[PDB]
């Protein structure tokens, strides 16, 4: 791992953590990520999550 100074490793790790977390948070505010699993039977509009 020598070429990259340990600084960038920790910054990239924190950036990955933050982007994944904010993506998950947006999933809560995502309108369409709810997808009532197995929509072959949309008879039941079971509001179910994703992401």
């Amino acid at each position: 791992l020598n070429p990259l100074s340990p600084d960038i490793w920790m910054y990239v790790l924190l950036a990955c953590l933050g982007v994944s977390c904010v993506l998950f948070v947006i999933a809560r505010f995502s309108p369409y990520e709810w997808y009532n699993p197995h929509p072959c039977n949309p008879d039941s509009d079971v509001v179910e999550n994703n992401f």
């Binding site: 809560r28 505010f29 999550n49």
Partner: peptide
């Protein structure tokens, strides 16, 4: 109400 719906889960 929608905020509560999608937060309380």
């Amino acid at each position: 109400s929608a905020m509560v719906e999608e937060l309380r889960m």
